[PDB]
Amino acid sequence: KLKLSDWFNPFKRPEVVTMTKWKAPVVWEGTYNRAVLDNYYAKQKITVGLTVFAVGRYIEHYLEEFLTSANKHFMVGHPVIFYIMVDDVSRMPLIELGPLRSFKVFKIKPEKRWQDISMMRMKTIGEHIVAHIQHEVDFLFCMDVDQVFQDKFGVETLGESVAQLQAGWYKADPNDFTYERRKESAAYIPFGEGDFYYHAAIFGGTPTQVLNITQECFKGILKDKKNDIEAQWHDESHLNKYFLLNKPTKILSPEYCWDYHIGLPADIKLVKMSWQTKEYNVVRNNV
Ligand SMILES: O=c1ccn([C@@H]2O[C@H](COP(=O)(O)OP(=O)(O)O)[C@@H](O)[C@H]2O)c(=O)[nH]1
Ligand SMILES: [Mn+2]
């Protein structure tokens, strides 16, 4: 039985939020003892999964770099399985994987609107968790493909349910957050409520918890469709609603998904992952 004090030291980063009102640590560089955690999880022989979708030109623009960086930085020292979801397997970049890495690849149907491509991921992930992921890993992370690992993204990020603080709003007040504000939407979060603004580019936890996250989020996505409304930030709006109602047991600082367009302020000590520059004119086909 692992105890928070065994690996997490919030006093190492006193200038930032390291603990939520419901506890749950906010993992910042310097606060975690990866050595302790690696030993602990290794003795449990855990396996970590990672899902990533690449539909359309996202394949050529980002899949190879994402996979290459993940192979080098994601849960090094532990068995990892990459679940690649593409609409065209013939364009699948097959890179050489290193020790403790392996993958499988699935062909999925490409949604017409990029907004649905992004949102339908919630449905697909759920189907795969029930079909096989629940039997193959102990923890699973679901990520956007348009980003690249820059440094070790390890076991210090594992937990029941894990959320990512969005790089651009981590210092803002809830009323500034771009939550969906229309009551007609299932993702609606009224002003006066909210803890943080989570990035949908990264989320995870145990297969069971991620299954519930994706389910619920997808149900909200379907509900909105029946009410002829679409959340402002699509799956992200819904994810934030979910995490408001079901608090994550662990949150990652913006160091784990950083936007260099912001520059590199004092709080961001060591970047583990960074956003790829947006290229919508090429990778997206509809407004
Ligand atoms: O045409 C599309 C739209 C989205 N995606 C996937 O859905 C995620 C969400 O999209 P995007 O990264 O474009 O969202 P943004 O972070 O720029 O809001 C992407 O990382 C991809 O994994 C995709 O493969 N093809
Ligand atoms: Mn993205």
CA distance 286 to 12: 46
Please, which residues have CB within 8 angstroms of residue 87's CB and are 6 or more apart in sequence? 55, 56, 107, 108, 109, 110
Q: Is 123 left (phi over 0), alpha (psi -120 to 50) or beta?
A: alpha
Method: X-ray
* Ligand 1 midpoint to CA 68 (Å): 18
CA distance 60 to 66: 11
Q: Where are the domains of the chain?
A: 1-287
Q: Is the beta carbon of 279 within 6 A of some atom in ligand 1?
A: no
* Ligand 2 midpoint to CA 201 (Å): 5
According to the 3-state scheme, what is the secondary structure of 154-201? CHHHCCCEEEEECCCCCCCCHHHCCCCCCCCCCCCCCCCCCCCCEEEE
Q: Is the beta carbon of 163 within 6 A of some atom in ligand 1?
A: no
User: Degrees (nearest 5) of the Cα angle 123, 127, 130?
Assistant: 140
Under 8 Å between Cβ of 195 and 244: yes
Please, which residues have CB within 8 angstroms of residue 131's CB and are 6 or more apart in sequence? none
| Residues catalogued as catalytic | 236
Q: Residues 108-127, buried b or exposed e (16+ Cβ, 10 A)?
A: beebeebbbbbbbbbbbbbe
Q: What is the CATH code for 1-287?
A: 3.90.550.10
Q: Decide: helix, strand or coil at residue 144.
A: coil
Under 8 Å between Cβ of 232 and 180: yes
Breaks after residues in the chain, judged by C–N over 2.5 Å = none
**Nearest Cα to Cα of residue 20 among 252, 199, 237, 213:** 252
Under 8 Å between Cβ of 49 and 211: no
Q: Is the beta carbon of 74 within 6 A of some atom in ligand 1?
A: no
Q: Is the beta carbon of 218 within 6 A of some atom in ligand 1?
A: no
CA distance 179 to 169: 11
Resolution to 1 decimal, in Å?
Answer: 2.0
Q: Helices marked H in the chain — which ranges? A: 34-43, 58, 64-73, 114-128, 134-136, 207-226, 234-245, 280-283
* Ligand 1 midpoint to CA 142 (Å): 12
Q: Is 100 left (phi over 0), alpha (psi -120 to 50) or beta?
A: left
CA distance 283 to 281: 6
CA distance 237 to 215: 14
Under 8 Å between Cβ of 99 and 126: no
